[PDB]
Amino acid sequence: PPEETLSLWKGEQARLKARVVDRDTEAWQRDPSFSGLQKVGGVAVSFVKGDSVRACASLVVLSYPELKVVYEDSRMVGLKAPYVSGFLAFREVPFLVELVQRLQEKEPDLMPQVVLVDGNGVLHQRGFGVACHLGVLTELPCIGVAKKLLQVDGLENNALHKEKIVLLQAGGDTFPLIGSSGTVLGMALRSHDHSTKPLYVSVGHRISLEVAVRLTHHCCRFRIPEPIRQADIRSREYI
């Protein structure tokens, strides 16, 4: 009953968006060296077309500060119709929740304290990206780490944007992503000395933007934050 389904999802999008928290809720987040942080998660998803859409997803957990994989669960499943633009997350995210639930059941001591999501946070067409959606359904702190600048609220990959990227001279350097509204939606981060291409970081849930950006940088042994890099490898394996 697709009209019923999409209508339900539209209501849920509004309700879930209102649940997004953009401040820190954990003691470890307020410590300058993130004292108390031991486990960082990574999530990545790739889709495949077919009679049914398939999703290849990976949840990994890494030790922190060491960034070594301590848990992994990577899967390919079919997702159920209806497939509606702007609402694929309403099939995708419950599958990701299932991964988290399986971790809680099978290895509860390895539950991540924060999840780095390969995808968008509040820097999103409707201010409710996959990282927000996963966060509110699990109550886990989540960060949206995007590889491209999302064109919302007047953000443009224009000449000035490109100039600001050049002026990111070293790993850790940032510049704010500020909408036409004047709202700070996220930060561009040069994640590593080796790469000149920035990551675009925004809050998913239960973390502040400053903390999200600093933690993201600290997870970058290479350009892509290690939990995402590891999840990416495993969700391309299934592709």
Residue numbers in the entry: 9 to 247
Copy text from the publication.
Removal of inosines from genomic DNA is dealt with by the base excision repair pathway as well as endonuclease V (EndoV), which is considered the major player. The mouse genome encodes a single EndoV homolog, mEndoV. Our data show that mEndoV shares substrate preferences with hEndoV by catalyzing cleavage at inosines in RNA and being inert towards inosines in DNA. The structure determination of mEndoV revealed a protein fold which is to a large extent similar to human and prokaryotic EndoVs.
The first 9 residues on the N-terminal end are disordered with no specific conformation. The invariant Tyr residue, normally pointing into the DNA/RNA binding groove and stacking with the DNA/RNA substrate during catalysis, is facing away from the groove. For this reason, the DNA/RNA binding groove in the crystal structure of mouse EndoV in the unbound state is wide and shallow. In contrast to all other reported EndoV structures, the invariant Tyr91 in mEndoV is interacting with the backbone of the protein through hydrogen bonds to Ser60, Val61 and Leu87. In order to stack with nucleotides in the active site pocket, the mEndoV Tyr91 must undergo a transition to the trans side chain conformation for χ1. The MD simulation suggests that the wedge motif has some flexibility and that the invariant Tyr might flip between two conformations, of which a probably unbound or unproductive state is shown in the structure of mEndoV. The corresponding region in mEndoV is 225-HHCC-228, and our structure of mEndoV reveals that the first two Cys residues in hEndoV are replaced by histidines with no change in the local geometry. The latter two Cys residues are conserved between mouse and human EndoV, and with similar conformations and local environment in the two structures.
